[PDB]
């Protein structure tokens, strides 16, 4: 119950490709910035703003249920 | 750093056992408030207060 949380103090300016991407998570409400990681296939973890587009796409069409 | 960055935001109030240690790292200085991150030999990572003297002693043998 200790853990550390994640947050994003950067994001990337670049649309990282879909089929490149296999997850992602929103940062803690806590952080001074909100934030999207999303996780590559590769397994590289990138920072995004929530509020570009692309990202709020890619989240939708994440969806499963 | 684009990829993110841990942060604490709740210290653990209770001394890790020296002995159950394994490794340490400060969280980003862009963190609202500054963290020890202590790994310990079970793999868990624990955010304690930088101005605990525990912490600081650990630390410092570390």
Redesign the interface.
């Known amino acids: ?10 994001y ?1 300016t670049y649309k990282i490709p879909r089929q490149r991407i296999m997850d992602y998570y929103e ?2 409400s ?3 910035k909100p ?1 999207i ?1 999303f996780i590559t296939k590769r397994g ?4 995004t703003n929530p509020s570009d587009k692309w990202v709020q796409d890619y989240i939708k069409d994440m969806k499963e249920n």
């Open positions: 119950p200790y853990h550390p949380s994640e947050c994003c103090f950067t990337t940062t803690n806590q952080c001074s934030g990681v590289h973890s990138v920072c």
